[PDB]
Design a protein around this motif. Structure first.
Motif, PDB file in Angstrom:
ATOM      1  N   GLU A  16     -34.332   9.029 -42.040  1.00 53.46           N
ATOM      2  CA  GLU A  16     -35.115   7.910 -42.620  1.00 53.46           C
ATOM      3  C   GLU A  16     -35.578   7.006 -41.473  1.00 53.46           C
ATOM      4  O   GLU A  16     -34.937   6.936 -40.416  1.00 53.46           O
ATOM      5  CB  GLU A  16     -34.238   7.097 -43.578  1.00 53.46           C
ATOM      6  CG  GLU A  16     -33.924   7.829 -44.885  1.00 53.46           C
ATOM      7  CD  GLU A  16     -32.776   7.185 -45.668  1.00 53.46           C
ATOM      8  OE1 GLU A  16     -32.006   6.325 -45.092  1.00 53.46           O
ATOM      9  OE2 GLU A  16     -32.578   7.504 -46.902  1.00 53.46           O
ATOM     10  N   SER A  18     -38.062   3.250 -40.762  1.00 60.58           N
ATOM     11  CA  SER A  18     -38.060   1.806 -40.674  1.00 60.58           C
ATOM     12  C   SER A  18     -39.291   1.259 -41.296  1.00 60.58           C
ATOM     13  O   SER A  18     -40.233   0.843 -40.628  1.00 60.58           O
ATOM     14  CB  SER A  18     -38.065   1.342 -39.228  1.00 60.58           C
ATOM     15  OG  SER A  18     -38.028  -0.077 -39.183  1.00 60.58           O
ATOM     16  N   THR A  19     -39.210   1.333 -42.500  1.00 62.61           N
ATOM     17  CA  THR A  19     -40.101   0.769 -43.418  1.00 62.61           C
ATOM     18  C   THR A  19     -40.747  -0.495 -42.818  1.00 62.61           C
ATOM     19  O   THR A  19     -40.134  -1.575 -42.792  1.00 62.61           O
ATOM     20  CB  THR A  19     -39.132   0.469 -44.514  1.00 62.61           C
ATOM     21  OG1 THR A  19     -39.748  -0.321 -45.507  1.00 62.61           O
ATOM     22  CG2 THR A  19     -37.904  -0.286 -43.993  1.00 62.61           C
ATOM     23  N   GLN A  20     -41.993  -0.421 -42.507  1.00 60.93           N
ATOM     24  CA  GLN A  20     -42.805  -1.630 -42.256  1.00 60.93           C
ATOM     25  C   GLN A  20     -43.530  -2.013 -43.564  1.00 60.93           C
ATOM     26  O   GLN A  20     -44.223  -1.186 -44.171  1.00 60.93           O
ATOM     27  CB  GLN A  20     -43.777  -1.408 -41.097  1.00 60.93           C
ATOM     28  CG  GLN A  20     -43.105  -1.264 -39.738  1.00 60.93           C
ATOM     29  CD  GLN A  20     -42.277  -2.497 -39.371  1.00 60.93           C
ATOM     30  OE1 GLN A  20     -41.799  -2.602 -38.243  1.00 60.93           O
ATOM     31  NE2 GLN A  20     -42.075  -3.446 -40.266  1.00 60.93           N
ATOM     32  N   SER A  33     -42.619  -4.482 -51.642  1.00 64.40           N
ATOM     33  CA  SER A  33     -42.164  -3.076 -51.627  1.00 64.40           C
ATOM     34  C   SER A  33     -40.805  -3.019 -50.907  1.00 64.40           C
ATOM     35  O   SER A  33     -40.544  -3.725 -49.946  1.00 64.40           O
ATOM     36  CB  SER A  33     -43.126  -2.195 -50.805  1.00 64.40           C
ATOM     37  OG  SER A  33     -43.266  -2.694 -49.484  1.00 64.40           O
ATOM     38  N   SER A  35     -37.139  -1.620 -48.928  1.00 62.43           N
ATOM     39  CA  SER A  35     -36.587  -1.301 -47.607  1.00 62.43           C
ATOM     40  C   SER A  35     -35.453  -2.256 -47.267  1.00 62.43           C
ATOM     41  O   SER A  35     -35.645  -3.249 -46.551  1.00 62.43           O
ATOM     42  CB  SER A  35     -37.624  -1.417 -46.500  1.00 62.43           C
ATOM     43  OG  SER A  35     -37.009  -1.175 -45.242  1.00 62.43           O
ATOM     44  N   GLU A 178     -35.703   0.945 -53.218  1.00 63.56           N
ATOM     45  CA  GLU A 178     -37.152   1.180 -53.266  1.00 63.56           C
ATOM     46  C   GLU A 178     -37.726   0.241 -54.321  1.00 63.56           C
ATOM     47  O   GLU A 178     -37.367   0.316 -55.505  1.00 63.56           O
ATOM     48  CB  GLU A 178     -37.425   2.638 -53.644  1.00 63.56           C
ATOM     49  CG  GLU A 178     -38.917   2.967 -53.736  1.00 63.56           C
ATOM     50  CD  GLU A 178     -39.184   4.426 -54.116  1.00 63.56           C
ATOM     51  OE1 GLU A 178     -39.275   5.326 -53.196  1.00 63.56           O
ATOM     52  OE2 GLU A 178     -39.318   4.754 -55.356  1.00 63.56           O
TER      53      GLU A 178
ATOM     54  N   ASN B  91     -34.099  -3.273 -40.567  1.00 57.77           N
ATOM     55  CA  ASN B  91     -35.258  -4.058 -41.010  1.00 57.77           C
ATOM     56  C   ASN B  91     -36.205  -4.314 -39.838  1.00 57.77           C
ATOM     57  O   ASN B  91     -37.331  -4.799 -40.022  1.00 57.77           O
ATOM     58  CB  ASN B  91     -34.785  -5.389 -41.591  1.00 57.77           C
ATOM     59  CG  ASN B  91     -33.941  -5.210 -42.855  1.00 57.77           C
ATOM     60  OD1 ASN B  91     -33.480  -6.194 -43.431  1.00 57.77           O
ATOM     61  ND2 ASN B  91     -33.710  -3.999 -43.327  1.00 57.77           N
ATOM     62  N   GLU B  93     -38.256  -2.617 -37.077  1.00 61.74           N
ATOM     63  CA  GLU B  93     -38.909  -1.339 -36.768  1.00 61.74           C
ATOM     64  C   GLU B  93     -37.940  -0.415 -36.027  1.00 61.74           C
ATOM     65  O   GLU B  93     -36.757  -0.312 -36.384  1.00 61.74           O
ATOM     66  CB  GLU B  93     -40.134  -1.576 -35.890  1.00 61.74           C
ATOM     67  CG  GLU B  93     -39.774  -2.119 -34.510  1.00 61.74           C
ATOM     68  CD  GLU B  93     -40.997  -2.359 -33.627  1.00 61.74           C
ATOM     69  OE1 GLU B  93     -42.179  -2.110 -34.080  1.00 61.74           O
ATOM     70  OE2 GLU B  93     -40.847  -2.811 -32.428  1.00 61.74           O
ATOM     71  N   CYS B  95     -36.802   2.256 -36.101  1.00 60.79           N
ATOM     72  CA  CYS B  95     -36.685   3.173 -37.228  1.00 60.79           C
ATOM     73  C   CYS B  95     -35.789   4.215 -37.147  1.00 60.79           C
ATOM     74  O   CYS B  95     -35.623   5.002 -38.086  1.00 60.79           O
ATOM     75  CB  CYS B  95     -37.919   3.978 -37.364  1.00 60.79           C
ATOM     76  SG  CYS B  95     -39.105   2.739 -36.974  1.00 60.79           S
TER      77      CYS B  95
END
Lengths: 295, 267, 295, 267, 173, 267
Positions: A16, A18-20, A33, A35, A178, B91, B93, B95
């Protein structure tokens, strides 16, 4: 087609990122949204699950450490998307289950027992060596967040849950949420949250998550109205009895004296709504001060 | 201008059989050895750079019979407290953490401003992008893996100079009076201090008299090479490979400061 | 696409065969193609690698036991193809790394340390439970093989290297050398290599790989100019001091007396160029004889 | 590949108030400090080069009230005896000497073959073009001038390593077993030897026990800095500034080899 | 440029650049972190409570981060503690008389610190409006609202000699 | 924006009849008088600049019967210790020293970023390119020459303000509360301090009461003009001509700080 052939690998694992984040006009609202990664779980090499029930509301950090920073300007929401995945990061040489299903009525005792759990939608536990997801039928009513207290039912859907019962050894996995929210009505304000007692009275007068009652015979009360992992920090003067003890609680971190005039700190990880922690100082209410940030 | 390309192996990690990560945040700047032991030797002739390529791979050298995560994501603002907590990490980046039994990579959107390296001090923000990070939370047992930094730099403006370096203690006082890279503090209860202010792989060489306690031990360090006695009057040597700025190494000799001498060349 | 899903199997393994060879006109040259299996490696359940650096030249058996038989008729070459694969024959229940990258300058101390290694192209180590390959930018100059000695730099590209650092248990894997050579100029000759000392002088006068110096205080010298696993065999008369000892060496096999008039044998596995082995017999040079075949 | 550009100042010359020149022939190779003290720090990661630009200027910093010549011309075959005589010199390209009260330059037709630097030894011919030369014959008085090397290099093939430095003697034997720049020979009648294999300004630091004879003397040397005893058990230090390769410095302690220890950092 | 009389409606605009500048999770330097402060004067004598203004804008917030607060910053008898987002630096000038500062600019809501309620407290000097609703305290509680001026205006206590105390938290507002 | 063009003459140099250079490193920024006494008067109305042209010439006004060198090369990073040593200097672009009996020039690759001048302080790196340098090593005798700064600037954004000047001491305290150029420290054992923060020729004028010790002495200074008593209650005056930033001058009056008053106009 299920049939024939199956490979339960020694190891399976996911990757997985790193949801931006992404957002909308005025109309009368903004959006979001997911994260987040809501606490884990930890073995259970035992025969009865054991739950971490975590509460859901735009502001309950113990379930949102990155979005509880943009609800200090609004009041009301949505949800349109929100699911929890058991990321899967632990080989198969380990096993059991990892229950994980939400119950609108985000507040009430988890049971004590499975069947009890295994009877409340959510549905979906699987083994720890695989990657599962979880989803929730979200509604459509303009509900309000908690600049307090209230009632845990008219302000937020309901808490989440997670159990895992096994014995083969490991540090199972992790999950998040999510989602996609709707934050109507333009407001703006909040903090700790800082709440002082003035010898005659107190002072919670700047955004909640806990109510501080005492039970006579001084032994006292130090509570919650919200759900998630927190960063306490606070209060002081006559460092008595004790301090910072805890009871229906999640992990505690105290790096204080006692203090008889000192300073203190702790990190909670709660369970379902309203878990409590307490001091011990005399008889009848005046003290010092404190501030409770969600995190 | 000149240029470059990566190949470094920035410190590892070490188990974590615990439920909260734990980070080694390492800082990025052409000269911060704790992130470049082979390139902090060609920035003593320039001042300013680039980056055009740079990624960190979790080499993967540890069976699956082990597991958890190995967070690994950079944050421009290479300086500020790591959090304390995950979500906090999860949280920002970067990732990309994965399990320890696999091979992952990491990459960074690099800019395009003529930034300056540190012939000091400054401010950790106007001189270097930001530090790197790495956490790993697990409990099943192992010595996870290793990583480096895939890169390609731009070193404008022709300059030339630097060091830390010979720095002697005179029974009453010391003596760093000829270019730095380390500050030598001591922590009472004599156990001592042997430090850095610069970053890269070095060639120590030095100091001596009453070869006591020890010597040349190390702690927040990169590779060590000691080919000395102890000495009670001897001679010594080591090669560091640091991590991010300020990693430390130490002796052990009594109680209250006088000794002998030393010299620290960068390399 | 990397993402999602990955199967690090318990076991992975490959199946390599038995390379049968291929060749060209006169023009002024012949050619070849690889298929060799250059020594392995052996655990390392330790925290610092450890290298077997093996040297590359058309004739250095410790890197070619099947092609060092067709360079006794030429002198000069090519390379157009050559890569080393870590065959992969050991389950994942084992791990670490297996560095493996060549350095033109096929002669110089390996470092001592990694970073040192992890800074010299080649690039490419991976774990032991997988199958990797290695490749080298080959040039284009008419270089000469060693009917000796020389200089380790003007006669051959550079040695190869291989390290592996781990602790989980196993006999990792094996590798070879994918190649295609060019052997210009028609020559023809060689052997051991047989090299006798005549009481007044010696005798290396029939193809090298070692130089035999002595260090006064008789303790002596028994050396290399080439790189690979060998088959010694030899020399004799007054079986003194010792014999066949070794120091910067690879595996030793002595099945002799001492001898005071006997016979002897050993198998080396060298490291990087020029590793040494020695006898011990008096004071001032005359002896008997020997022959060193590469293998 | 990577690249570079010059800026070095290769040793001077010194009068010659005599009728036969006298040469300082200095050797050229990416790593030969006696001809590069700032670039012999980025060839410990490669092996092979170029040259595309390189010239030597006689800076000119000495009035005309002085005169003679300052020969200065390179010879590919960077190794072989300078002659003994001029014509000999004045017959080998380079060309170009002029008087000391003017500013001249020198240039060299550079080739184009992927040559290798010396992680040793070799042969002085297959590894480096050839040494440089410089003579000056005059009698009117002065400290003529200075020069450098205008250049631009090509360092192919990614490698990485090297050094000379801590090197101890063990009563039976010694110990240089951690990167060089000097070889320590002795000449019997104990008077001794303390040498170089590399070229540049250094920071010595070291060795000790029976503080005899002397110590740290010097002969074919550049500036010396000793801040020691003698020591009969002490500590010591010096800064060299050499000349062309292999300049020597020495102690003085008895008869037959055992001592103490030392470490020589380049700087 | 642009002042006008108070009985009219004026606007003001600024040539904005284009460099990826960083906000202050502190301190720094007031120049590499923010463009520059604004200003406003008014000189008159005829009587009134002139008017009001705001800031017409559109921002760009790159790089995903996340964190901060007061800001809460405690002193531990041996040392202090600003370790959770700034706007002020607390220096002292010997002869204890002390220092209570800023690194940021705007109207704030102080709230804080305590134990031996000495000398004074919460005084101010290069400051904007002050609001103290505390004791002194010799163990109490306190509060104030600043309205600053240009960067770095200062406020201070008064308690002895050599640094240990209690705690505080400074929210911007 | 507005613009400019050079014509300044930045301090000289003075012999050096010694074997190690010796530097006057002078800093560059639209407002740093020790590098601009005629243009630091039109940056009190703006903030930000350019450079498009700027070079330093060694005017040449001293016969050849004198010699050595006069290093002179700028280093963007206008702040950091000069070395101590040449090679160090002779490795940092700029390039260009020549002898003192000739006329040389110097030039600098100028950039293109909207940098800000110092209405202070800051950081010496984000506000100005870097300082200039100049060394000269020789022994034959003379007062070498002089230089300036060929330039053309860009002063964007319309601002306007600044100063240092009248600054009185009030028995309890002082008073600099109306534009600077000097900081008045004292060194105990009363002997005192009378300083600068700016650079150029000035017109002092000032201060008084108990005309003690002395007054108006000077040390790292340029020309002095005192037309006062001593005063024990008098009046005084002087003209400075400084050197690079921060040169100092002082009085002498007792023990512990109260006095009278002063005013320092730039001119």
């Amino acid at each position: 087609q299920k049939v024939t052939r199956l490979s339960a690998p020694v190891a399976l694992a996911y990757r997985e990122v790193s949801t931006q984040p992404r957002v909308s006009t005025a109309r009368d609202g903004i959006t979001r949204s997911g994260s987040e990664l809501i606490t884990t779980l930890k073995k259970n090499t035992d025969t009865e699950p054991k739950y971490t029930t975590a509460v859901l509301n735009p502001s309950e950090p113990g379930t949102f450490n990155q979005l509880i920073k943009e609800a200090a300007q609004y009041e009301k929401y949505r949800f349109t998307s929100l699911r929890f995945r058991y990321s899967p990061m632990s080989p198969s040489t380990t096993g059991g289950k990892v229950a994980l299903a939400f119950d609108r009525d985000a507040a009430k005792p988890p049971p004590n027992d499975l069947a009890s759990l295994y009877n409340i939608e959510g549905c979906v536990s699987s083994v720890p060596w695989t990657g599962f997801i979880l989803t929730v039928p979200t509604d459509s009513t303009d509900r309000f967040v908690a600049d307090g207290i209230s009632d845990p039912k008219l302000v937020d859907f309901g808490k989440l849950i997670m159990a895992t019962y096994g014995q083969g050894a490991a540090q199972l996995g992790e999950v998040r949420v999510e989602y996609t929210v709707q934050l109507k009505n333009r407001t703006g304000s909040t903090s700790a949250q800082i709440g002082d007692f003035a010898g005659v009275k107190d002072g919670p007068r700047l955004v909640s998550w806990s109510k501080t009652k005492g039970t006579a015979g001084w032994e006292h009360d130090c509570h919650f109205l919200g759900t998630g992992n927190f960063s306490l920090t606070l209060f002081y003067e006559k460092a008595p009895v004790s301090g910072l003890e805890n009871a229906d609680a999640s992990d505690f971190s105290v790096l204080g004296e006692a203090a008889a005039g000192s300073v203190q700190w702790a990190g909670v990880k709660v369970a379902e709504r309203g878990q409590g922690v307490k001091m011990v100082t005399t008889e009848e209410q005046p003290k010092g001060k404190w501030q409770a940030l969600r995190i």
